[PDB]
Amino acid sequence: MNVTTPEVAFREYQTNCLASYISADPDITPSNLILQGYSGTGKTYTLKKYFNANPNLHAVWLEPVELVSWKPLLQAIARTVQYKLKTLYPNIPTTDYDPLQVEEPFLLVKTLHNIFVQYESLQEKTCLFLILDGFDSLQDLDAALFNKYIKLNELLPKDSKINIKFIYTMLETSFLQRYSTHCIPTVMFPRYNVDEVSTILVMSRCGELMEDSCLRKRIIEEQITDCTDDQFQNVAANFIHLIVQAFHSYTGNDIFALNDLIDFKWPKYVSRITKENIFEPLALYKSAIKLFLSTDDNLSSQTYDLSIISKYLLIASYICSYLEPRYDASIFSRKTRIIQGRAAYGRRKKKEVNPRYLQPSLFAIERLLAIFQAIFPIQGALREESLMKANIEVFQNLSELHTLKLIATTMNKNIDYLSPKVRWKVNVPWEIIKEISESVHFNISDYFSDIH
């Protein structure tokens, strides 16, 4: 061949095994080629570096993540093949066919055949490389769509001058282990190394940190004249190594989860150099130890902007959907008897399985209303009857909690609320219920004290 292998820094097998499968002669070229990798593993970068190193052969860049189901995929293929040929061989009479006419795979075959048989006026047979970058990143994807793209060169004509050669790009490896007997040339992309991530980030990012003016205004805000370009790039690479050895156990081997951490923690690191932190590597790290212990990636006082009865309804629904229904007359029953009766004894042995790790239980609405007026604070001289009854506002706030997806139920499609067969459950976790019970000052830690 006459292809030029690119100098990709850490994919040395893959560019050699990629120049052994992409050529300008359609006979020494496979009709399908998979490039299976994972997120960040360098597929698109080495593909674009290869196709830019070889300007003579023709690419069609198509990304089936912004084309959700299969019909915009066929329409986009039939659109952009024709648009690529219009700007490749301009002096051929090109009768524009509508890509929206493609509605089925057969009509893609017929449309592409009618597009290709009008370019017979060339001299020699060429291949056109249609790249489906992210074929497993299709959103409404099925297991039998890929069989419709393998067996497409079986339908395009054999003695034609433009031959379609596909280059897929997969991401999942349980997708690809279905199309294994088809024996397509697979070029796998293994996950990057920490020693390779730590310098991929340096060669990618230390250009746009010295050219990031938050540091180039800090060098003149601090009156710094003991600097050169090495004195900027060494603290840039040292910061990148600091984010790597600090946060690699957090992210993993993903360039994307490191790029944004470097983007976040950079100006709060430039704001710690004063006059001589640019010369040393250790007291600058001891001047900014606060941004290398915790990650600080969340979007950050109070907990929830709800009412009082809705907060107590959330607490009571949290109680009754984790407590067994038999043991509540030992925890809430408090009033003096007049008639001979016995209360609930309670559980003998504390079970240490910790029920509030699991999924909740399902209760009737009378148990929520009963536990609601047991845990409610006193309101309101003998005609008050201060034990609050469930008025309109309690039911309205309960329906508001069901609307806000905080209490929830067995979602049958368009369920009736007023049935004695629809039971309710909470779907908020413990970590917000503790903040809520802290807000209304409700002792809930001693409600699950008899489990752990």
């Binding site: 052994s20 299976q36 990798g37 994972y38 697979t186 796998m188 992309f189 156990s249 993993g252």
Partner: protein, 106 residues
């Protein structure tokens, strides 16, 4: 070496197109005739390629796991091994990560 690779192809996937996809980047990456001759003498590419074909299935990408991710995976497999039908969640997994790491610091 070539007959040995054909012999292990005969017991694995018994197919000529897998051999074709093995042989094609051997012939195409070579640059001189002596290089092609020693490359098919030694078969220096049918173990580079054949290593790369298994480079991420369940072993070549578990090899690239980090340390916290490995402790989380080990704890989750412990929790699923302890259960009846093999199910768990993030709370039952983190209640084994901190227990294991507290026994590490013990």
């Amino acid at each position: 070496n070539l007959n040995r690779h054909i012999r292990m192809n005969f017991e694995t996937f018994r197919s000529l197109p897998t051999l074709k996809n093995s042989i094609i980047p051997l012939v195409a990456t070579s640059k001189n005739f002596g290089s092609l001759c020693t490359a098919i003498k030694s078969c220096s590419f049918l173990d580079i390629y054949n290593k790369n074909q298994l480079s991420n299935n369940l072993t070549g990408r578990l090899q690239s796991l980090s340390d916290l991710e490995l402790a989380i995976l080990i704890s989750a497999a412990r929790v699923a091994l302890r259960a009846k039908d093999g199910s768990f969640n993030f709370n039952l997994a983190y209640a084994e990560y901190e227990k294991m790491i507290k026994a590490i610091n013990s």
